[PDB]
Write an enzyme that holds these catalytic residues in place. Structure first.
Site, PDB file in Angstrom:
ATOM      1  N   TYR B  89      30.358  71.258  -8.429  1.00  0.00           N
ATOM      2  CA  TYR B  89      29.766  70.154  -9.209  1.00  0.00           C
ATOM      3  C   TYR B  89      28.324  69.845  -8.803  1.00  0.00           C
ATOM      4  CZ  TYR B  89      34.655  69.643 -10.535  1.00  0.00           C
ATOM      5  OH  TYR B  89      35.924  69.837 -11.017  1.00  0.00           O
ATOM      6  N   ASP B 149      42.139  70.761  -1.973  1.00  0.00           N
ATOM      7  CA  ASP B 149      42.354  72.090  -1.365  1.00  0.00           C
ATOM      8  C   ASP B 149      41.545  72.237  -0.060  1.00  0.00           C
ATOM      9  OD1 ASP B 149      43.967  72.940  -3.490  1.00  0.00           O
ATOM     10  OD2 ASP B 149      42.240  73.895  -4.528  1.00  0.00           O
ATOM     11  N   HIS B 388      31.301  79.049  -7.552  1.00  0.00           N
ATOM     12  CA  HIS B 388      32.101  78.629  -8.720  1.00  0.00           C
ATOM     13  C   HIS B 388      31.481  77.369  -9.313  1.00  0.00           C
ATOM     14  CE1 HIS B 388      34.406  75.160  -7.280  1.00  0.00           C
ATOM     15  NE2 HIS B 388      34.491  75.734  -6.135  1.00  0.00           N
ATOM     16  N   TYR B 469      37.048  66.413 -17.606  1.00  0.00           N
ATOM     17  CA  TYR B 469      37.399  65.293 -16.706  1.00  0.00           C
ATOM     18  C   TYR B 469      36.293  65.076 -15.673  1.00  0.00           C
ATOM     19  CZ  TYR B 469      40.222  62.365 -13.797  1.00  0.00           C
ATOM     20  OH  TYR B 469      40.642  61.314 -13.027  1.00  0.00           O
ATOM     21  N   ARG B 470      35.578  66.134 -15.320  1.00  0.00           N
ATOM     22  CA  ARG B 470      34.650  66.122 -14.172  1.00  0.00           C
ATOM     23  C   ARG B 470      33.757  67.337 -14.323  1.00  0.00           C
ATOM     24  NH1 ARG B 470      36.965  66.539  -8.001  1.00  0.00           N
ATOM     25  NH2 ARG B 470      35.034  66.163  -6.878  1.00  0.00           N
TER      26      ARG B 470
HETATM   27  C1  LIG Z   1      37.372  76.441  -4.114  1.00  0.00           C
HETATM   28  C2  LIG Z   1      37.321  74.964  -4.467  1.00  0.00           C
HETATM   29  C3  LIG Z   1      38.460  74.175  -4.491  1.00  0.00           C
HETATM   30  C4  LIG Z   1      38.422  72.799  -4.812  1.00  0.00           C
HETATM   31  N1  LIG Z   1      39.600  72.088  -4.815  1.00  0.00           N
HETATM   32  C5  LIG Z   1      39.544  70.812  -5.177  1.00  0.00           C
HETATM   33  C6  LIG Z   1      40.728  70.064  -5.280  1.00  0.00           C
HETATM   34  O1  LIG Z   1      41.837  70.507  -4.953  1.00  0.00           O
HETATM   35  N2  LIG Z   1      40.636  68.742  -5.681  1.00  0.00           N
HETATM   36  C7  LIG Z   1      39.417  68.158  -5.950  1.00  0.00           C
HETATM   37  O2  LIG Z   1      39.391  66.961  -6.233  1.00  0.00           O
HETATM   38  N3  LIG Z   1      38.269  68.857  -5.836  1.00  0.00           N
HETATM   39  C8  LIG Z   1      38.329  70.117  -5.484  1.00  0.00           C
HETATM   40  N4  LIG Z   1      37.156  70.824  -5.356  1.00  0.00           N
HETATM   41  C9  LIG Z   1      35.879  70.163  -5.716  1.00  0.00           C
HETATM   42  C10 LIG Z   1      35.109  69.443  -4.587  1.00  0.00           C
HETATM   43  O3  LIG Z   1      34.582  70.429  -3.721  1.00  0.00           O
HETATM   44  C11 LIG Z   1      35.920  68.401  -3.798  1.00  0.00           C
HETATM   45  O4  LIG Z   1      36.365  67.424  -4.744  1.00  0.00           O
HETATM   46  C12 LIG Z   1      35.169  67.707  -2.657  1.00  0.00           C
HETATM   47  O5  LIG Z   1      36.120  67.015  -1.853  1.00  0.00           O
HETATM   48  C13 LIG Z   1      34.186  66.705  -3.200  1.00  0.00           C
HETATM   49  O6  LIG Z   1      33.031  66.553  -2.336  1.00  0.00           O
HETATM   50  P1  LIG Z   1      33.081  65.433  -1.192  1.00  0.00           P
HETATM   51  O7  LIG Z   1      34.470  65.033  -0.865  1.00  0.00           O
HETATM   52  O8  LIG Z   1      32.198  65.898  -0.091  1.00  0.00           O
HETATM   53  O9  LIG Z   1      32.355  64.174  -1.860  1.00  0.00           O
HETATM   54  P2  LIG Z   1      30.770  63.914  -2.013  1.00  0.00           P
HETATM   55  O10 LIG Z   1      30.061  65.178  -2.404  1.00  0.00           O
HETATM   56  O11 LIG Z   1      30.291  63.217  -0.773  1.00  0.00           O
HETATM   57  O12 LIG Z   1      30.740  62.840  -3.210  1.00  0.00           O
HETATM   58  C14 LIG Z   1      31.129  63.181  -4.559  1.00  0.00           C
HETATM   59  C15 LIG Z   1      30.332  62.345  -5.526  1.00  0.00           C
HETATM   60  O13 LIG Z   1      30.736  60.951  -5.355  1.00  0.00           O
HETATM   61  C16 LIG Z   1      29.604  60.106  -5.482  1.00  0.00           C
HETATM   62  N5  LIG Z   1      29.434  59.409  -4.172  1.00  0.00           N
HETATM   63  C17 LIG Z   1      29.810  59.898  -2.988  1.00  0.00           C
HETATM   64  N6  LIG Z   1      29.607  59.055  -1.994  1.00  0.00           N
HETATM   65  C18 LIG Z   1      29.216  57.876  -2.619  1.00  0.00           C
HETATM   66  C19 LIG Z   1      28.961  56.579  -2.152  1.00  0.00           C
HETATM   67  N7  LIG Z   1      29.078  56.249  -0.859  1.00  0.00           N
HETATM   68  N8  LIG Z   1      28.646  55.659  -3.097  1.00  0.00           N
HETATM   69  C20 LIG Z   1      28.557  56.001  -4.389  1.00  0.00           C
HETATM   70  N9  LIG Z   1      28.753  57.195  -4.927  1.00  0.00           N
HETATM   71  C21 LIG Z   1      29.098  58.086  -3.984  1.00  0.00           C
HETATM   72  C22 LIG Z   1      28.453  60.970  -5.963  1.00  0.00           C
HETATM   73  O14 LIG Z   1      28.456  61.068  -7.375  1.00  0.00           O
HETATM   74  C23 LIG Z   1      28.816  62.307  -5.316  1.00  0.00           C
HETATM   75  O15 LIG Z   1      28.168  63.405  -5.972  1.00  0.00           O
HETATM   76  C24 LIG Z   1      37.188  72.194  -5.046  1.00  0.00           C
HETATM   77  C25 LIG Z   1      36.034  72.991  -5.010  1.00  0.00           C
HETATM   78  C26 LIG Z   1      36.095  74.355  -4.738  1.00  0.00           C
HETATM   79  C27 LIG Z   1      34.799  75.127  -4.657  1.00  0.00           C
HETATM   80  C1  LIG Z   2      40.996  76.240  -6.982  1.00  0.00           C
HETATM   81  C2  LIG Z   2      40.446  75.139  -7.437  1.00  0.00           C
HETATM   82  C3  LIG Z   2      41.058  73.777  -7.370  1.00  0.00           C
HETATM   83  C4  LIG Z   2      40.244  72.659  -7.998  1.00  0.00           C
HETATM   84  C5  LIG Z   2      40.825  71.439  -8.260  1.00  0.00           C
HETATM   85  C6  LIG Z   2      40.113  70.395  -8.834  1.00  0.00           C
HETATM   86  C7  LIG Z   2      38.798  70.576  -9.187  1.00  0.00           C
HETATM   87  O1  LIG Z   2      38.126  69.534  -9.754  1.00  0.00           O
HETATM   88  C8  LIG Z   2      38.187  71.799  -8.929  1.00  0.00           C
HETATM   89  O2  LIG Z   2      36.874  71.863  -9.281  1.00  0.00           O
HETATM   90  C9  LIG Z   2      36.072  72.821  -8.614  1.00  0.00           C
HETATM   91  C10 LIG Z   2      38.903  72.829  -8.338  1.00  0.00           C
END
Ligand SMILES: Cc1cc2nc3c(=O)[nH]c(=O)nc-3n(C[C@H](O)[C@H](O)[C@H](O)COP(=O)(O)OP(=O)(O)OC[C@H]3O[C@@H](n4cnc5c(N)ncnc54)[C@H](O)[C@@H]3O)c2cc1C
Ligand SMILES: C=CCc1ccc(O)c(OC)c1
Ligand SMILES: Cc1cc2nc3c(=O)[nH]c(=O)nc-3n(C[C@H](O)[C@H](O)[C@H](O)COP(=O)(O)OP(=O)(O)OC[C@H]3O[C@@H](n4cnc5c(N)ncnc54)[C@H](O)[C@@H]3O)c2cc1C
Ligand SMILES: C=CCc1ccc(O)c(OC)c1
Lengths: 524, 524
Positions: B89, B149, B388, B469-470
């Protein structure tokens, strides 16, 4: 002739004409009799404190938009009802005395969609719990509603005040999925997946893309909701409702401390557990005069007569279990083993007990299975002219907190000459102390006592860290005033949003203590 | 030298001094090397479209307020991270190229409170899933987290993007309870029961009194969150995770139609069920070149080789059961009887299978029990330079909708030279089609192909009624553009609120397609 605050007789005349041009002469009501019908049935302090100047019944969303644009043009304040049965909180009466009431539910009363397989309905405001139950039983009988105690309320209106019921789907706002809303200058919007034209998922997930706004339209004056989705639970294969009577007022501490660990995983306490005191249960099946005809508080021996004549405890627990008979039996065994550690506890199932003392048991068995009822209105026969005002602060579901609240509230009720009729309810991690403060609505002194008592109860609860969840028109400024962390930061935020969306200060001014700029700081 | 848009070199110099004057020079980073660490690791598009001009790390809420006040004075746009692992994202990169990043998690990284009995934590943004798991195992071991994950993300940041995991507590925003947030002009507020000074209930119910605003701070640029509560599930007494392999790509229709009725009541499908295709599973334990080193899409024979070599099907179902062994066995029997109706279906438990083809099964067993993991990062070894971009539209959980999406997305992926690696996920009543669009981040053509593919996938999904959704920074304007019911009513509502709360247009401009007035319609 009642005029809205800050509107000339001239502008009021012009607006009523414009409203008639939109909705039809029949659906613009200004006659004495129709306006009286919108009086709060249970007024606290002045009976005259919350009057309507007119009632407008729009046909549909497009007419709601036009009536809102007309209100904007003439500075007409508009209050809002679905079914207007918000009794305990003002009924259909506007917070701002002299507002024009938008009666959405008179003509916007359709069940628009029921999907039986995916378990949802799309509803207009006028759909009552009775209406939806009837429809499911006729057209989608694998589904059931979640209803509050009284079925004449609105599935929409109740969710929009964050009302609740008692099945696993008890949190009405949580299961609300998608809405259409007319914003305060007349623009219309769909939330969630409904904002995507031609979406097939409006009722399947409550969030769409971007900031999630639906909560901002609950306990709110930010818009007039015209459609609302709600998820609907499948009926389980079987259910059973049970009553646990507890003899001692002091049993409250242990009842709550056993209840929380049995409810926090949503099993074995599968529904919303309720713990009703003797008065709340007795008042459904008897009048106060049957037990005591003297002055002052109910004497202890009148309480004991109620317990013994009706076969009730001081505290009366009601829960429901769902699933195959084998799971019900297993869960009931766990419940009986846990609460049975309290000496004097007695367990009875809805199949075991059918006497006058089981009336509430049999009513909870309906409500907990999504079968709506008006049996609880028999409460309002406890004394002549009975009304109630809601008092329902939130606390930790901890026995020490329950006992402190029981004692604090009952001692003030005695002092202010009102009976202590209350229940403790645990949603999941939170406890409600829901006191039904019963008073003679025809007695100015009783009405004033009730307002004074409730103001004191709110302040004393807030001083212990227990905030009110929902309140009457008369109490909204005080209750919002208790949520004043950071020098009143929450209200300042709400005011900024209110003025941005509602620059002309039209929609239900003062709802939840949030006044648009033109009415703010006027003491009404 | 990277400058924010609409800020002079002079005002940028002055703002940087002012930021240093609050947070300390160590916590104002402008060096090329530190700024490169905030690059999107998986850029679609130009690799330089979303640059940071500086990164500020505030100590605490008060410093967050002062940095927001400084940004207001100088017109500095401020983007926001917790841990900045939003990979798929945009990672830690701002939507608005040249924004200053507020790194909340570097210094605000404390677990502030854990209540084991009432099952909650109060958290700062820098607490990772690994951090919270380690704390619970050390101090409150009856509780478990719900993790995505990859465990390196933020419990707060993930919830604020409405991320999700796979235990019964998978909806992160739903279990979020209370927050503290700095509003865009520097005022601080607490939501819910935390607005009542000294309340004991901030983490026990998400609503307070009045309009419910927490959702408006998710997928949002309306505030900088400084504390967030979350409810925590009790560990069950036992669990078991199982794999169901389905041989045929065409089995998807029946898998989904058997899945929904087993999930909608949250039993017997007790966790969030996932259905992963062969590539998504093979890519955890192998590289593409192990199966195929020719050009074009993977040939059918290579797909069959993956299935046969790893003992997997085209579709691979993973679920977890919780409770006493007798309930697990009963529920597993219902699951086996129902899905066993599909010819070729094969069932293995986490106790039965430990070979290469069980790597995903053993990893899901961790994730579904709130044991965080980084095993899924092995997906990113599938091809050299792999990145990705998220694609995850919502649909009805209906086999005909699943097949339509499987075919539409795979056929475009083949056309755009991307492998079809995807899963179908049912939350409760809603289905997600989560496609892992893998591309060579080092190849300008591959980056542009991936952006063009994803724009096409979003438009074709939207036309079928399936909303995203996102989404990634690069896709936010397009995705919000799909939610344009009522001539763009939802976006106009968001803009009204954004300009009211943020008159200087400071916080994460363009997040979710919501631009403050000064940046709106500038093509950035
Ligand atoms: C292989 C792979 C698998 C994944 N699997 C999943 C999964 O199972 N489920 C899932 O949900 N995602 C998944 N993701 C997506 C993502 O990588 C995760 O959701 C990750 O946990 C989000 O980044 P973060 O927790 O560091 O949040 P951050 O990057 O810190 O924050 C996310 C967003 O929240 C907002 N934000 C954050 N902090 C604040 C604050 N203090 N105040 C206001 N706004 C704020 C901003 O918009 C920011 O861009 C996956 C990605 C990949 C590449
Ligand atoms: C293997 C991917 C799991 C996954 C779950 C939720 C998400 O939003 C996502 O975006 C990257 C990826
Ligand atoms: C004895 C007794 C028992 C009760 N038991 C319960 C109970 O178990 N659970 C419970 O929740 N309540 C209970 N109540 C309180 C109350 O009576 C019910 O909540 C009732 O259902 C609310 O009224 P309603 O459904 O007609 O909604 P309405 O009165 O139509 O609407 C409620 C409020 O929502 C807003 N509103 C309504 N429609 C719109 C609209 N279209 N757009 C925007 N805003 C709108 C307004 O603020 C309005 O005042 C009880 C009351 C009594 C007297
Ligand atoms: C018997 C009363 C039940 C009850 C439940 C919830 C409420 O908000 C309420 O307000 C009046 C009453």
């Amino acid at each position: 002739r009642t005029l809205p605050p800050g509107v000339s007789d001239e502008d009021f005349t012009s607006a009523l004409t414009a409203f008639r041009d939109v909705v039809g002469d029949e659906f613009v009501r200004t006659d004495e009799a129709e306006l009286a019908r919108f009086h709060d049935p249970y007024p606290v302090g002045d009976a005259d404190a919350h009057l309507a100047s007119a009632v407008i019944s729009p046909r549909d969303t497009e007419q709601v938009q036009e009536v809102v644009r007309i209100a904007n043009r003439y500075g007409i304040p508009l209050s809002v009802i679905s079914t207007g049965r918000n009794n305990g909180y003002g009924g259909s009466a506007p917070r701002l005395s002299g507002a024009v009431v938008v009666n959405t539910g008179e003509r916007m009363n359709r069940i628009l969609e029921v999907d039986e397989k995916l378990g949802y309905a799309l509803l207009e405001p006028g759909v009552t719990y009775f209406d939806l139950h009837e429809y499911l039983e006729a057209h989608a009988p694998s589904l059931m509603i979640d209803c509050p105690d009284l079925g004449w309320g609105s599935v929409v209106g109740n969710a929009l005040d964050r009302g609740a019921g008692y099945t696993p789907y008890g949190d009405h706002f949580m299961w609300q999925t998608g809405m259409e809303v007319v914003l305060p200058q007349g623009d219309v919007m769909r939330t969630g997946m409904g904002a995507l034209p031609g979406s097939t998922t409006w009722q399947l997930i409550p969030y769409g893309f971007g900031p999630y706004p639906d909560g901002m339209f609950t306990q709110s004056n930010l818009g007039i909701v015209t459609k609302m989705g709600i998820a609907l639970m499948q009926k389980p294969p079987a259910s059973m409702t049970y009553q646990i009577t507890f003899e001692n007022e002091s049993d409250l501490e242990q009842i709550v401390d056993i209840m929380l660990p049995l409810r926090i995983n949503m099993a074995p306490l599968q529904n919303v557990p309720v713990l009703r005191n003797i008065i709340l249960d007795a008042a459904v099946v008897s009048q106060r005069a049957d037990w005591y005809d003297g002055d002052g508080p109910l004497p202890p021996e009148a309480i004991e007569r109620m317990k013994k004549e009706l076969g009730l405890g001081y505290w009366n627990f009601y829960g429901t279990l769902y699933g195959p008979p084998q799971l019900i039996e297993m869960n009931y065994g766990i419940i009986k083993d846990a609460f049975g550690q309290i000496p004097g506890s007695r367990f009875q199932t809805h199949e075991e007990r059918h006497d006058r003392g089981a009336h509430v048991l049999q009513d909870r068995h309906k409500i907990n299975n999504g079968i709506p009822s008006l049996s609880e209105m028999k409460l309002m026969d406890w004394i002549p002219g009975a009304g109630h005002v809601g008092f329902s602060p939130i606390s930790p579901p901890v026995g020490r907190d329950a006992m402190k609240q029981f004692r604090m509230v009952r001692s003030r009720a005695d002092e202010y000459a009102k009976d202590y009729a209350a229940q403790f309810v645990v949603g999941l991690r939170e406890m409600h102390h829901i006191a039904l403060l019963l008073f003679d609505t025809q007695d100015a002194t009783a009405r004033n006592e009730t307002l004074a008592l409730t103001r004191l109860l709110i302040d004393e609860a807030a001083a212990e860290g227990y905030g009110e969840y929902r309140t009457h028109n008369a109490l909204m400024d005080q209750v919002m005033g208790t949520y004043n962390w950071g020098d009143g930061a929450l209200l300042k935020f709400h005011e900024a949003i209110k003025d941005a969306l509602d620059p002309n200060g039209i929609i239900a001014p003062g709802k939840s203590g949030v006044w648009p700029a033109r009415y703010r700081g006027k003491g009404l």
